[PDB]
Design a protein around this ligand. Structure first.
Ligand SMILES: Cc1ncc(COP(=O)(O)O)c(CN[C@@H](CSC[C@H](N)C(=O)O)C(=O)O)c1O
Ligand code: PLP
Ligand code: 85F
Ligand code: CA
Ligand code: CA
Ligand code: CA
Ligand code: CA
Ligand code: CA
Ligand code: CA
Ligand code: CA
Ligand code: CA
Ligand code: CA
Ligand code: CA
Ligand code: CA
Ligand code: CA
Lengths: 301, 302
């Protein structure tokens, strides 16, 4: 028995790739779309809220407010439904309408900004929204240690346990950098020889080239006006990238060939991993790819 | 949770207690079949129908799988056929949530549509035409295949028994084929002879309770093949429960608002029928299990 959907967060499956040629290495996909809120962000939503509760920062009528590209808003929305907290989310208009559908299904209010101004514009609008709230809590996934700490405590430990401490490579898409950084931190503490790589959009190559641009790999990319504090670049063994169309194409390869329905970033992260496997062919590596969310919310895309 | 393929994620779904919505002094647990990798309970029947036909020698590498579905059986078949590399053709009514066609095509399915006004009967009739154009095929036929109710008899029911440590007073399940109701209820009544088991049908298509059909919006539920499906076993029904379209939508919304459970329209219908039952039997401490057939994401566009 689960006492609520909160008890279903985490413990997500790790699935082997069987039909796609992975070049003499084994690739496993950790399916964070299996979380009740359908993304890895259920983990950080829960930890940011639960630690804030313990620190006395959240009363029953505290309005939670967060800037998000969608999934952190959804995770927060589901958790706030269970906890009976009021949530307001600021997000860009460029993101999939299904993200909005999902947040509103849980009773969350959504405020929209111009997506051509990036997540920076979301954060600016959030400052305006604070002025009208008597009592609020901003989790701030861009700075909150409990974003990467969630992954350090659960996501990484699950990877280690399911693969019996035999993991050679971990590859993960980045937006805040929290899932990459928290998970890689724990993996590296337990497995000193593991290689860990972040992925970013080829069209928004901030970490690899020093500049941003518009891209279509929803959830990935860094658009707050700098590298987020929760991204730990020292963990990156190299920066991997993926083009927009290649990410969409790989999303369909995974669903057609493996029955894995992941999001656009899953396509991006998996393409990057498969390219890595190919460059490192026939080594017998155990490679883990984080799939951040499920593909159902991208059918309109 | 290391899996060899997504097929290994089918089943072992969670039972969640209802905490925030008033349940009138009985305990209601929802079995979340939306946790399946294909997002519905139909993954269980897709797997068993395919695996049994494989063992029978009815599916070779080049056998085309052909099925009539309202969506979820097609999605479950599509996901499994993607892993197994079988060619799948699905016939569905054009009146269902348009996420269904997209989901199915994402897995490689060929989707053929029939006039929704004609119901599933039109889908089944269209299969006759598809069969003439194929050298090798297998039709799972969820409406007649005993491996539909047997999948639930074998897995769904056992998980309910295990998770509640054989303490189950009432089981309430929505119907379309009637397979999830009938297979689960059969097992439960074998192990617990005092358990009450109830199917739910749409109030505006009350075939079982009033002997006629009509239009309804509770996608996946209702019986529109031109009679009661062979896999429905009405001898298991302690009563027939119903739900109106508006109440099903209202309760779908209340579940997501108050419990963070995003179930489909039929989950709203089944849960509403369960709440009505629990109110009629208020404060008896009954342990009531409601099967949530699918998750709600595919309905949120309308
Ligand atoms: C979302 C949803 N809820 C309930 C059901 C009913 O489950 P059982 O079939 O009774 O185990 C379904 C099943 N959907 C089937 C079609 S059932 C027949 C049609 N409703 C009809 O004759 O009109 C499917 O996915 O094909 C379901 O999907
Ligand atoms: C779908 C999706 N992919 C990738 C990311 C990025 O994760 P992180 O914020 O941990 O970098 C997010 C957020 C997301 O919602
Ligand atoms: N996936 C996150 C957002 S990460 C940062 C964003 N991609 C950016 O452009 O800065 C979420 O909010 O769900
Ligand atoms: Ca306080
Ligand atoms: Ca609310
Ligand atoms: Ca160490
Ligand atoms: Ca190193
Ligand atoms: Ca390209
Ligand atoms: Ca199994
Ligand atoms: Ca009471
Ligand atoms: Ca045999
Ligand atoms: Ca195929
Ligand atoms: Ca095909
Ligand atoms: Ca009514
Ligand atoms: Ca809608």
């Amino acid at each position: 028995l689960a006492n609520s959907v909160i008890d279903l967060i985490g413990n997500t499956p790790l699935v082997k790739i069987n039909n796609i040629d992975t070049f003499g290495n084994e690739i496993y996909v950790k399916l964070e779309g299996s979380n009740p809120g359908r993304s890895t962000k259920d983990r950080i939503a829960l930890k940011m809220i639960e630690e804030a509760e313990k620190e006395g920062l959240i009363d029953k009528d505290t309005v939670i407010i967060e800037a998000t590209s969608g999934n952190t808003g959804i995770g927060l929305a589901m958790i706030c439904a269970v906890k009976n907290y009021k949530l307001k989310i600021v997000m860009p208009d460029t993101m999939s309408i299904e993200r909005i559908q999902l947040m509103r299904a849980y009773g969350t209010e959504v405020i929209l900004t111009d997506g051509s101004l990036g997540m920076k514009a979301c954060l600016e609008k959030l400052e305006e929204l604070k002025k009208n709230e008597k009592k609020y809590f901003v989790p701030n996934q861009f700075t909150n240690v409990n974003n990467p700490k969630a992954h350090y405590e659960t996501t990484a430990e699950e990877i280690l346990k399911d693969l019996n401490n035999k993991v050679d490579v971990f590859i993960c898409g980045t937006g805040t950098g929290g899932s990459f950084s928290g998970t890689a931190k724990k993996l590296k503490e337990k497995l000193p020889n593991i290689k860990t790589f972040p992925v970013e959009p080829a069209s928004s190559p901030l970490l690899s080239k020093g500049y941003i641009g518009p891209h279509k790999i929803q959830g990935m990319g860094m658009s707050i006006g700098g590298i987020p504090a929760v991204y730990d670049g020292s963990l990156a063994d190299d920066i991997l990238v993926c083009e927009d169309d290649d990410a969409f194409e790989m999303m369909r390869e995974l669903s057609f060939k493996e029955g894995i329905l992941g999001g656009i970033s899953t396509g991006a992260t998996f393409k990057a991993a498969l390219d890595y496997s190919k460059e490192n062919a026939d080594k017998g590596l155990k490679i883990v790819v984080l799939s951040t969310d499920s593909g159902e919310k991208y059918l309109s895309n």
